[PDB]
Structures are given as C-alpha cells and as structure tokens.
Amino acid sequence: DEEELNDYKLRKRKTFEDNIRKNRTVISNWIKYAQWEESLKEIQRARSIYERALDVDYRNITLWLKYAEMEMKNRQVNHARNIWDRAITTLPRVNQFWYKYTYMEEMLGNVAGARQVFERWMEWQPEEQAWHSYINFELRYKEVDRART
Amino acid sequence: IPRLLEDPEIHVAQYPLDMGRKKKMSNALAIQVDSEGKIKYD
Amino acid sequence: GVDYNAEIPFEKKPALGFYDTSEENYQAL
RNA sequence: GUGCUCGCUUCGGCAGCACAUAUACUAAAAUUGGAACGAUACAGAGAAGAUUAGCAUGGCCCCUGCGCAAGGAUGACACAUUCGUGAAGCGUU
Ligand SMILES: [Mg+2]
Ligand SMILES: [Mg+2]
Ligand SMILES: [Mg+2]
C-alpha cells in the first residue's frame, strides 16, 4: 500500500498523459483517463480531465454525457446541474442532452425545474417527438390544462 | 410570538423564510430574474 | 519530474454553478 | 573647507554671512540547490527479407549555426461463421 499503490498510479497516469500528448485528440484516450481517475475516486482530477477534453473538442456528445454521468454517479447534483446547463447552451440541437436533463430533474423531484427546462427547450421549436415528451411529462401528473396549452 | 419562519417589535432573532443564520460559504451564484421575466440561465 | 507525482500538473478547479460543491469530498482507495 | 564682514579685535579664540548639499546591487562574505556528452557499466541505427539514399509531418524535445540557409542517424521522439442485455422516448393492439 502506502508507496506501492502510488507507483502504480504514476505509471498509469503518466501513460495517459503521454497518449494524450501524442495524439492530442482521439478522445477515447481522454475518456479512458477520466474513467480511471473516477474509479479511484479522485474526482477532482477527473473533472479537470473532462474540462481539458472539452477544450480540445466541445462538440463531442459522448464526452459531455460521460462528464455529466460521472458527476451524477458520485451524487454531485449541483455539478451535474451546471454541466447539463452548459451542454444545452452550447449544443442546443442535441436532443440527448435535453432528454437526460429533464429526466434528471424529474428523478430529483424538481417538477418545476423540469418544466422550466422544457419551456427553454420548446423555444428551439424542435421535433414532434420532443413536444410529445413534454406533453407526456405533464400527463404523468394530472395537469391536463397544461397539456392542452 | 411565532418562533417559526412561517408567521422589529418582537425583539427576537426571527428569520422569516430562509435567511441563513449560520456560516455556509455556499458556492451558488445567485440566480437572477431581470425586470419582468426570466431566470437568467444564460 | 514532480510535475506529475507531487503536484497536480496543471489545475483547473471546476467552475462553480448555482449549487453547493462545498460539502462534497471523496473516499480513499 | 575657502573667502568676507573698516565683525568683537587681537592676530588666539569666538560670532555672523556667502559659497559648497545626500554615494552605494553597501559585503573585502556566508549559505543555497541544476549542469560534464568524463570514465565506467549495460545495451546497440528508421522503412520490407537484408543493406542502405533521403526530403518531409506534429511539438510541455532539443543542439550547431548571423541566419527566413544548412546540418546534427532521414537529429531524437511516433506502437469467418453469429448476437443479446439495461434504461429512456414515441406511436399501436
Ligand atoms: Mg545515410
Ligand atoms: Mg535535417
Ligand atoms: Mg527528422
């Protein structure tokens, strides 16, 4: 343990950095690195990795999903909330972000929050299915007037 | 008389809804609404 | 040499957003 | 410090005035930690079976070079069968 574990981390950690520096992008390297630090519960490091990966390629939707997911897995609700907001702000067209964002809020219990999100979403005049999901959302509660509106 | 947030003369510490009485140093950056409308999520 | 194993190479503390990250800390291995 | 007050006034002292106005990583020290391309030792040149010519590309790698020239090993670095979960959304019986 105390030192023996440590050396292991240097070899992995250093290797991860080498891979990234060599290829720069190829975000499977970024992601694997993030995952490893997440597994060791060094999530502050993980956050920085994800942010660095975003600097390289902010459009990559798998990256963002892995980032938000990581926060949620560690019960870091408010971090996740921030991240979701960013994702939808910079890549509004990606419907996956919206669906997950509303789902998370619903799970947390924040119906008002979810409603707010959906109202933002609808401003983009999206797709038939999105509207259906908003209506269905309302219909999981009575809220028939809202649905009709 | 109330002794709860629900309910100057009182001469009591009363905090009526949610003004914090103990240090938190909370991260959150104040949510804002502008004039009539919107939570300024931007 | 110590830009790795001593001190976090380059650090970006995450930006802080409408929620409380003060409380959160994480477990050892 | 120099000169001048028909200064006190002898030639000693004292007084007044004018002129002259701020040097300096203060050390003649003490401490404190990266490099020699030394020898030694191990090992031993990219590309395809081998032997080799090279221009390149990229930069938390340099060196020589006045150089936007050219060299440094091309400077080094670059490692055919056959599917199903789990969750969510939408439409239908
Ligand atoms: Mg040759
Ligand atoms: Mg050359
Ligand atoms: Mg070369």
C15 touches chain B (CB under 8 A): no
In angstroms, what is the resolution? 4.9
**Chain B, window 11-40: residues with a beta carbon less than 8 angstroms from a chain A beta carbon:** 27-28, 39
Torsion angle, CA of A12/C6/C16/A91, rounded to 10 degrees? -30
As to burial, measured by CB atoms within 10 angstroms (0-12 exposed, 13-18 middle, 19+ buried), residue C3 is: exposed
Mutate to test the interface with A, among C8, C12, C13 (most CBs of A within 10 A): C12
CA distances to A7, A66, C21 from A79, rounded to whole Å, are: 31, 13, 7
Instruction: Kindly determine whether the C-beta of residue A135 is less than 7 Å away from any atom of nucleic acid strand D.
Output: yes
Write out the two tokens for A125.
């005049």
Question: Is A45 in contact with C8 (CB distance < 8 Å)?
Answer: yes
The technique by which this structure was obtained is cryo-EM
Q: Which residues of C touch A47 (CB under 8 A)?
A: 12, 14
As to burial, measured by CB atoms within 10 angstroms (0-12 exposed, 13-18 middle, 19+ buried), residue A10 is: exposed
* H-state helical runs in chain A: 4-23, 27-39, 43-56, 61-73, 77-90, 95-108, 111-122, 128-138, 144-148
SS3 A5: helix
Task: Collect all residues with Cβ–Cβ distance below 8 Å to B14 and sequence separation of at least 6.
Answer: B2, B5
Terminal-residue alpha carbon distance, chain C: 24
Question: Is A71 in contact with C12 (CB distance < 8 Å)?
Answer: no
SS3 A119: helix
CA atoms within 13 A on the CB side of C23: 12
Q: Of A44, A79, A43, which is closest to residue B27 (Cα–Cα)?
A: A79
Mutate to test the interface with A, among C3, C24, C25, C27 (most CBs of A within 10 A): C24
Q: Which residue has the tokens 């009485």?
A: B21
